[PDB]
Amino acid sequence: MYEMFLFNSVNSKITQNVNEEFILKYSDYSCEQLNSLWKEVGLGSYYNGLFKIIEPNDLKDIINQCYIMDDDESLLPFMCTAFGDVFAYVKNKRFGNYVVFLNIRYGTSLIIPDNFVAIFNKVIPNQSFLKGWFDLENYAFVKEKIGEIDFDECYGYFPTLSMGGNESIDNISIVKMIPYIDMNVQMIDVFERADK
Amino acid sequence: DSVTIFILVIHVKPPFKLKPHYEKEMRRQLKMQEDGINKLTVFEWLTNRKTFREKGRTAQNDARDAYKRRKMFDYMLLSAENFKYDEITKKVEDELSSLAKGRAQNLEDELLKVLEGPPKIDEEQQKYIKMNVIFAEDLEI
């Protein structure tokens, strides 16, 4: 279902083609549109390193303490940007399931209908939306100046924006993603809704 | 010499907690933050925290956004020529209108309490005090 997603990604780097015992590890927290994605798309870097299909358990413990909505039952992180932002699949039987985009730089949450086909095929390959929804316009620029990242690295601000940092490229440093996101999730209490 | 100096010793409450190579990376990255903060003036840091907090503005709002963003996905899967974010958001927005406090904030408070804690510290003066925060050594296990 994600041909139109995979094609617009130039320079992909699959780090681990996806199993089935892997997919069954998350049956309690996943959904079929995401299980078929793990079937069509393996864990790796996509769209020039901007996007990282991750092992959910790398982050799932970090972010399940995150209050997004009343009656959330589980948050399943399945993707990360090159800045440490987190995409999670959220099970919620009062509101209906949905995807949350957690902007780790601005400490905000974006509620996205759980239409993985729309998300991966028509929102991601659309620069308007990379800018409008995810604030990733300056990815090319940042990489020109700071360098390219591996799969488990990202661009951190030091100090982060939440701890009074500037947001200039002077403060960006390639660092290990998972401890970065952990750090940032411990700084901000509530990821408030993104003015959008 | 002939100078007056304002010298601030704040810890982050609660301390950062932790649950091999991982603890190395986090002490390492917390110090980097800790050092990056102490290079900032009180004035700088607070102008940056104000800038950060002006990002982000509910069951009804999320219900509103639910309806709007579900419509855009409809338009978008239907057509095969992409839409522009600025256009399509305003489109659906007028369709609907036709039927319509953790660690970093504690740090900002701990600090703001110092700056007012007599003698009160003024905005111009803030351009001349260096941050003095310690938190990386407090990493609980």
Side-chain angles (χ1 to χ4, degrees):
Chain A
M1 341 179 86
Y2 307 104
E3 291 77 37
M4 181 173 33
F5 163 78
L6 284 145
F7 221 76
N8 285 69
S9 146
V10 300
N11 261 77
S12 326
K13 162 223 182 144
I14 285 95
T15 71
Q16 196 214 312
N17 260 345
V18 158
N19 208 164
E20 159 69 292
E21 166 201 329
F22 165 95
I23 292 187
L24 280 209
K25 181 149 44 146
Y26 299 120
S27 42
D28 265 2
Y29 319 99
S30 192
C31 81
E32 256 310 333
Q33 258 174 165
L34 174 50
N35 296 319
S36 37
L37 172 85
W38 288 325
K39 276 156 198 167
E40 279 204 358
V41 160
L43 320 184
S45 299
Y46 294 85
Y47 290 79
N48 289 345
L50 172 60
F51 279 117
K52 321 178 161 308
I53 310 309
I54 53 134
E55 188 68 32
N57 281 338
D58 289 357
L59 281 164
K60 105 148 282 208
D61 211 46
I62 284 154
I63 73 147
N64 260 247
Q65 61 226 24
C66 273
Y67 178 85
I68 304 286
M69 245 187 235
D70 268 40
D71 302 297
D72 289 345
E73 318 178 325
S74 59
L75 289 84
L76 184 65
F78 62 94
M79 192 172 50
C80 289
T81 80
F83 285 106
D85 315 317
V86 174
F87 291 76
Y89 175 67
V90 188
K91 270 179 38 155
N92 186 308
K93 79 166 156 181
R94 180 203 49 106
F95 180 89
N97 304 354
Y98 66 92
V99 177
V100 61
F101 175 67
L102 300 168
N103 199 317
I104 219 81
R105 281 158 291 137
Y106 303 147
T108 51
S109 54
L110 193 69
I111 319 286
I112 303 171
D114 52 304
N115 192 345
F116 282 69
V117 177
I119 283 145
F120 275 67
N121 287 332
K122 271 236 168 272
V123 170
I124 293 197
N126 186 303
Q127 305 280 351
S128 296
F129 276 72
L130 292 192
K131 181 191 164 167
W133 268 6
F134 310 127
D135 295 340
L136 301 174
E137 52 281 359
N138 307 320
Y139 172 67
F141 180 47
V142 171
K143 197 172 60 117
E144 204 65 42
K145 292 186 79 66
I146 301 312
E148 300 172 60
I149 54 199
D150 299 352
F151 184 73
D152 64 330
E153 292 163 342
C154 75
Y155 305 122
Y157 290 89
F158 288 92
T160 67
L161 314 184
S162 86
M163 300 270 266
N166 255 278
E167 192 173 13
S168 87
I169 312 203
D170 289 354
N171 300 90
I172 294 170
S173 336
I174 309 183
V175 296
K176 237 62 154 171
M177 212 175 56
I178 309 269
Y180 185 60
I181 303 172
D182 189 351
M183 207 177 44
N184 269 278
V185 148
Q186 300 195 59
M187 283 162 190
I188 271 285
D189 191 2
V190 163
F191 284 79
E192 335 184 292
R193 288 299 175 277
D195 190 23
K196 272 154 212 258
Chain B
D1 212 3
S2 215
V3 63
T4 38
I5 308 103
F6 304 59
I7 305 257
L8 248 55
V9 202
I10 296 158
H11 298 256
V12 167
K13 339 175 165 300
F16 295 97
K17 308 185 163 57
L18 171 55
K19 298 317 311 139
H21 192 178
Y22 199 86
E23 63 185 342
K24 170 209 103 43
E25 262 142 23
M26 272 223 67
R27 309 202 111 105
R28 185 225 181 129
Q29 278 196 195
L30 280 169
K31 186 68 184 163
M32 267 159 87
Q33 296 271 325
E34 187 180 89
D35 300 330
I37 290 189
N38 299 327
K39 297 163 159 203
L40 299 180
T41 48
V42 166
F43 180 79
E44 273 169 327
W45 192 89
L46 283 177
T47 309
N48 289 339
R49 279 278 319 179
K50 257 231 175 290
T51 285
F52 169 89
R53 279 179 349 249
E54 42 150 31
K55 291 241 189 50
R57 58 89 208 188
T58 282
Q60 228 194 311
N61 295 105
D62 289 349
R64 259 150 204 143
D65 313 314
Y67 190 73
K68 278 185 252 130
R69 314 192 168 130
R70 270 193 245 120
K71 211 134 208 93
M72 329 181 322
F73 284 8
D74 284 333
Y75 290 118
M76 296 174 59
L77 317 153
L78 262 202
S79 153
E81 217 63 71
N82 309 339
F83 277 79
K84 269 44 81 203
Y85 176 76
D86 291 300
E87 326 187 294
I88 177 145
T89 57
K90 294 309 170 295
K91 188 207 264 141
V92 317
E93 280 223 51
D94 297 328
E95 266 148 52
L96 177 34
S97 219
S98 277
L99 199 60
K101 310 322 179 74
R103 305 206 201 308
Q105 185 59 44
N106 298 329
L107 190 38
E108 184 167 24
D109 292 336
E110 230 171 323
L111 172 75
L112 264 157
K113 166 76 188 200
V114 166
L115 297 177
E116 248 191 349
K120 201 218 205 230
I121 286 317
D122 283 7
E123 222 212 337
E124 182 245 6
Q125 270 148 346
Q126 279 156 25
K127 319 199 183 134
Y128 298 96
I129 304 82
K130 284 283 185 18
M131 273 331 263
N132 178 12
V133 307
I134 314 108
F135 51 85
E137 335 170 1
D138 309 12
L139 171 74
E140 279 212 6
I141 320 292

